[PDB]
């Protein structure tokens, strides 16, 4: 997270860490939505251009973490995956359109003060919160600069940007399954997600029912915090039927 601060304990109970068994390295971030399903960005798992294709057996999910590199004995839980599902129309050949993936864990995790899932938005909530100017929050154990890694989970609150402005900031085709967030160069405020944060959540707190909803997923960007650029996120509500399907087709 560039220009973001350390989080608090219990601040993002849904934040997950995807770990690689060998080498033991942080890979991506994710979120817990039920006691058995974790949600991440598909390119964290599959990206042919760079020969990336992980399978159940190559990953570990650490939940309840705060520190990045330490095994927080008695606080975090480590689970194995049972199945990974990628969106059948994930577009890695062009613009990471539909950058969403679901992971089923072996056994259900128990919640605690540090582990709790996040809500998934319904049409009304999406409609009322995905507006330009509304800030949302992103967290992760990613890079602190483009070119410098944090010891604790970082946070940053970013405004959502007007689609046309998102569009005029790049030469990549933005679809309706993506939104962008960040501050205009003119707002003299900074922050962004960066390498290591992909897959994590973008949540908003509902001022109607005091709940946190995950509106997006960290998907891509052109660098980290460049003035003029914005970060793109996957639009969870637009891919929610997908979500439902696999969950009520493969478990809960």
């Amino acid at each position: 997270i560039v220009e973001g601060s350390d989080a608090e304990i219990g601040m993002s109970p849904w934040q997950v860490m995807l770990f690689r068994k060998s080498p033991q390295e942080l890979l991506c971030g994710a979120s817990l939505i039920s006691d058995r399903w974790v949600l991440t960005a598909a390119h964290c798992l599959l990206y042919p251009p760079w020969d990336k294709n992980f399978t159940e057996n190559d990953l570990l999910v650490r939940i309840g973490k705060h520190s990045r590199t330490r095994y927080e004995r008695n606080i975090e839980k480590i689970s194995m995956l049972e199945k990974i599902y990628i969106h059948p129309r994930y577009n890695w050949r062009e613009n990471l359109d539909r950058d969403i993936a679901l992971m089923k864990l072996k056994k259900p995790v128990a919640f605690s003060d540090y582990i709790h899932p996040v809500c998934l938005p319904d049409r009304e909530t999406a409609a009322s919160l995905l507006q330009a100017g509304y800030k949302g929050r992103v967290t992760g154990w990613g890079n602190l600069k483009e070119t410098g890694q944090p010891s604790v989970l970082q946070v940053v609150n970013l405004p959502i940007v007007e689609r046309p402005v998102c569009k005029d900031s790049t030469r990549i085709r933005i679809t309706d399954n993506m939104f962008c967030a960040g501050y205009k160069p003119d707002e003299g405020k900074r922050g962004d997600a960066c390498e290591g944060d992909s897959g994590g959540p973008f949540v908003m707190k509902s001022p109607f029912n005091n709940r946190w909803y995950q509106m997006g997923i960290v998907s891509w960007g052109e660098g980290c915090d460049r003035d003029g650029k914005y970060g793109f996120y996957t639009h969870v509500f637009r891919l929610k039927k997908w979500i439902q399907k696999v969950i009520d087709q493969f478990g809960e």
Partner: peptide, 11 residues
Amino acid sequence: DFEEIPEEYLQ
């Protein structure tokens, strides 16, 4: 950089 995790989680 990371710390060793309880062998049991790799198997």
